Design a protein around this ligand. Structure first.
Ligand SMILES: CC(=O)Nc1cc(Nc2cc(NC3CC3)n3ncc(C#N)c3n2)ccc1[C@@H]1C[C@H]1CN
Length: 331
């Protein structure tokens, strides 16, 4: 027996109803700007797949962000470009301003709208209970949008969320791991940061959907209200599921494995053990209690579920009591 198939509970056939060129990124023809419009100012960071810089558009004197891509598969470049162009104009989704290439090196560079970010390891410790609900609602606007457009981000983590706190401005950035959702498709489970990886990734369930992003958002929320970063702190991908099972318990995990007929890796048998489902109160203390409320805990519970089909959708999450104040203040 193989694993039981799964379909997204919402926006299942959005790409099926779209013309193939919408999602067939392999056949996308890139539109190139002029590299001489941009001059690099200073370096911002590095990664495995790129080096990013702050730049100046010399034609309008506007501040931009340049992501000079390291050598990767051209279809992976087309995927990011295609996804960025499809989500252009969407709420709290970074804007791809231009796509340029060096004429000598032949290296592609992605040009982004600039967000005057306040580093998450300095910002978060200053954030109030209202700040957390406000920004969580802003990421949810961006997730419901990309999900309604047939796209799963697959890398939701604090580093990929740009916040200009002065102007209460939020942008969900780095769409290099994003994919298009197609019913029946089996995806790569070696996506996302260890700490933000959903149970589906860790057990090797390949037929996942947008609900992957909801798990990641749940990990992010728990790190914020509890002031514990990272919240699930595994030493590897195997220990990452053990750290989760020590909070959610192994009963719901084995019931999840059962439901979908998941062949669990034998390495897991001896490390998972037997753990009870813990109450959220054991992460509450004098230094975080001002951020923890019964609403926050209820919302968090409804996101962090093994069974991807039982987690809240981004639209269901926006309707939760935790955001009543934010929703009211938005009128
Ligand atoms: C361009 C990308 O997605 N990556 C990436 C981005 C940044 N930093 C910033 C900073 C800012 N504003 C701060 C105040 C200067 N803004 N504003 C908009 C964007 C975008 N898009 C952006 N990115 C750093 C490092 C990387 C490394 C490649 C990743 C490896 N994890």
């Amino acid at each position: 027996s193989g694993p039981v198939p799964s379909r997204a509970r919402v926006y299942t056939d959005v790409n099926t109803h779209r013309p193939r060129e919408y999602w067939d990124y392999e056949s996308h023809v890139v539109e190139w700007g002029n590299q001489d419009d941009y001059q690099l100012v200073r370096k911002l960071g590095r990664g495995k797949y790129s080096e990013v810089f702050e730049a100046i558009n010399i034609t309008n004197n506007e501040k931009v962000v340049v992501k000079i891509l390291k050598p990767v598969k051209k279809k992976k470049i087309k995927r990011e470009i295609k996804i960025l162009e499809n989500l252009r104009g969407g709420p709290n989704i970074i804007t791809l301003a231009d796509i340029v290439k060096d004429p000598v090196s032949r290296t592609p560079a992605l040009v982004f709208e600039h967000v005057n970010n306040t580093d998450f390891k300095q910002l978060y410790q200053t954030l109030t209970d209202y700040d957390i609900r406000f920004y969580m609602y802003e990421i949810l606007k961006a997730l419901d949008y990309c999900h309604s457009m047939g796209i799963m981000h697959r890398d939701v983590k604090p580093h990929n969320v740009m916040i200009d706190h002065e102007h209460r401005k939020l942008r969900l950035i780095d769409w290099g791991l994003a994919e298009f959702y197609h019913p029946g498709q089996e995806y790569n489970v070696r996506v996302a940061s260890r700490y933000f990886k959903g149970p589906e990734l860790l057990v090797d369930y390949q037929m996942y959907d947008y609900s992957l992003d909801m798990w990641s958002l749940g990990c992010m929320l728990a790190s914020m209200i509890f002031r514990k970063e990272p919240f699930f702190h595994g030493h590897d991908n195997y220990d990452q599921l053990v750290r989760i099972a020590k909070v959610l318990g192994t009963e719901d995990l084995y019931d999840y494995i059962d439901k979908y007929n998941i062949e669990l890796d034998p390495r897991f048998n001896d490390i998972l053990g037997r753990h009870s489902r813990k109450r959220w109160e054991r992460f509450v203390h004098s230094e975080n209690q001002h951020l923890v409320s019964p609403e926050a805990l209820d919302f968090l519970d409804k996101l962090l579920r093994y069974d991807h089909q039982s987690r809240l959708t981004a639209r269901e999450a926006m309707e939760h009591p935790y955001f009543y104040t934010v929703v009211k203040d938005q009128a």
